[PDB]
Amino acid sequence: GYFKIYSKHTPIFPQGFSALEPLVDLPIGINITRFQTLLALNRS
Amino acid sequence: YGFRPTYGVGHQPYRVVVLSFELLHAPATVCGPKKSTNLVKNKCVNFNF
Numbered sequence: 001g002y003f004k005i006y007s008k009h010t011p012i013f014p015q016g017f018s019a020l021e022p023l024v025d026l027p028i029g030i031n032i033t034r035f036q037t038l039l040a041l042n043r044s
Numbered sequence: 045y046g047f048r049p050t051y052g053v054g055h056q057p058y059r060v061v062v063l064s065f066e067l068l069h070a071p072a073t074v075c076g077p078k079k080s081t082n083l084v085k086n087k088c089v090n091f092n093f
């Protein structure tokens with residue numbers, strides 16, 4: 001029931017090794033079975 | 045309701061608030077405050093961090 005997010009930002013699939021450090025452990029406690037990215041459509 | 049100022053003690057309106065404690069399968073998120081003590085260094089102490 002904890003939705004854990006890890007994140008990392010690299011300047012410049014690139015070769016190399018970089019580990020991801022935990023970001024936010026949310027106590028959502030919900031079922032997650034589908035996922036979909038949401039984008040921003042700038043009218044300008 | 046008969047909220048008259050001249051009513052008796054048993055008839056005067058009173059504010060009542062009911063608290064419900066619900067335990068669910070989801071992780072608990074409303075816990076009581078935790079008391080903490082001072083910090084003792086360079087001594088054999090029983091600790092809890």
Ligand SMILES: *[C@@H]1O[C@H](CO)[C@@H](O[C@@H]2O[C@H](CO)[C@@H](O)[C@H](O)[C@H]2NC(C)=O)[C@H](O)[C@H]1NC(C)=O
Pocket residue numbers: 042043044
């Ligand atoms: C949507 O597009 C507009 C137009 O390109 C963006 O406005 C520009 O914002 C940049 C900074 O990111 C400024 O340097 C430009 O001068 C802006 N242009 C104008 C015409 O004002 C706007 O930021 C975009 N919207 C979002 C939410 O990023």
